[PDB]
Amino acid sequence: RLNWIIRGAVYEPYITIFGNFPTNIDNTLFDISSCSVNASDPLKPKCPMLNADNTPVFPEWLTIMMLCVYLLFANILLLNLLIAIFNYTFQEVQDNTD
């Protein structure tokens, strides 16, 4: 859908990147969309995949592995920004404190 694409693409991942713990990696086919024929404002995420009684055609272990890798590199770049601020603050404090 038009709004569902910008919801899932941009409105979703930053909250996951902030690190507040989601339950979104837990369940598949839990009927939160209930399917691709929704066209409903509550029924947003549009039934990720169809298979024999389970949602994923390829399972959630890749989805949590890629999630952990994503969190790892995001914290890498965040600590890079931390050292980027620390270098200027220390170059300020490397001058004579008296």
Burial class (CB in 10 A: 0-12, 13-18, 19+), 56: middle
CA torsion sign, 72 to 14 to 28 to 30? positive
Q: Are 25 and 71 in contact (CB under 8 A)?
A: no
Give me the amino acid identity at 48. Answer: P
- The two tokens of residue 13 are 């991942």
How was this structure obtained? cryo-EM
Whole-angstrom distance, CA of residue 62 vs CA of residue 58:
8
Q: Are 34 and 47 in contact (CB under 8 A)?
A: yes
Q: Are 31 and 57 in contact (CB under 8 A)?
A: no
Query: What does 49-73 look like in DSSP terms, one character per residue?
Result: ---SSSS-SS-HHHHHHHHHHHHHH
Whole-angstrom distance, CA of residue 74 vs CA of residue 41:
31
Q: Are 44 and 7 in contact (CB under 8 A)?
A: yes
- The two tokens of residue 91 are 């170059």
